[PDB]
Amino acid sequence: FRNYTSGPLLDRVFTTYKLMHTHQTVDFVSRKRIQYGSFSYKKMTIMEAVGMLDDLVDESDPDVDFPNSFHAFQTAEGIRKAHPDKDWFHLVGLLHDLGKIMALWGEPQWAVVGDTFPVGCRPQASVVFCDSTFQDNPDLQDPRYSTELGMYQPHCGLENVLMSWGHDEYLYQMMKFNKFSLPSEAFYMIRFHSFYPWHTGGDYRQLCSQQDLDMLPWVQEFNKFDLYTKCPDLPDVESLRPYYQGLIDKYCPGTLSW
């Protein structure tokens, strides 16, 4: 799992992180936040959006080579079986990767999927391929962003950090805009679930607040289902749909703005 030294997909995953690192700059993230922050691209229900991902495969994932819609159901199912008393958490599983619809809207996948990292400051060691994929990034030539803290004050809190643009931040802002009625923990887990250097690699604590640290266990708990439920054996989506539609009706019903 999560093997970046070996694997049959390693070729397309290295290409995709080298290209996203080489191009996720402060300006770019700043533009994309505006480009998508009005959620005026499409109107859809959750299940519509999930079904859109019937038409999408993730090019950064070394563990998956099937429509990402299925992965949504697998993650929700893993969570549901381990945390029966937390239905909202089951939904988070289904919802967490819906931001990848951007790839169907013409975005290059390096601007949609993959591990995230803060722009505006020096990449730390636990960033996938850090040593070999950042040399062509203009921000690093910029004294404003080349240092450890870069443009940030210490412990500013991750909510005040500009993350590399992708499905995490898109979906987080989407849910705020539509006013999903999930607990704070849900919004936070989704917003930072891709931030491996932080929740796994132990890095970027120079930017974290005590609030962020307190959320670490929640992100890590979601993460283990996010990652380890990935399997070629697909779920019976038709059978599962009604259960998850019930949760959708409770937490984020009807047509939403994307």
Q: Name which position in 60, 75, 124, 164 contacts ligand INS (CB under 6 A).
A: 60
Q: Please give the residues from 60 up to 99 whose contact with Fe ion meets the rule CB under 5 A.
A: 97
Under the binding rule (CB under 6 A), the answer on residue 107 touching ligand INS is no
Judged by CB under 6 A, the number of residues near ligand INS is 10
Under rule CB under 6 A, which residues in 27-46 are in contact with ligand OH?
A: none
Both tokens assigned to 133? 């994929």
Please report, as residue ranges, which positions from 90 to 129 form the binding site for ligand OH (by CB under 6 A).
Answer: 96-97
Instruction: Kindly list the distances between the CA atom of residue 200 and the CA atoms of 61, 94, 121, 140, 237, in Å, as whole numbers in the listed order.
Output: 16, 22, 19, 24, 30
- Binding to ligand INS by residue 97, rule CB under 6 A? yes
Residue with smaller CB distance to ligand INS, 61 or 203: 61
Does residue 58 touch ligand OH according to CB under 6 A? no
Least CB distance to ligand OH at residue 249 (A): 24
Contact 136, 22 (CB under 8 A): yes
Among 18, 193, 199, 230, binds ligand OH (CB under 6 A): 193
Q: Which residues pair with 248 in a beta bridge?
A: none
**What is the footprint of ligand INS within residues 221-250 (CB under 6 A)?**
none
Distance CA 116, CA 176 (A): 20
Which chain residues interact with ligand OH by CB under 6 A? Answer: 96-97, 193, 226
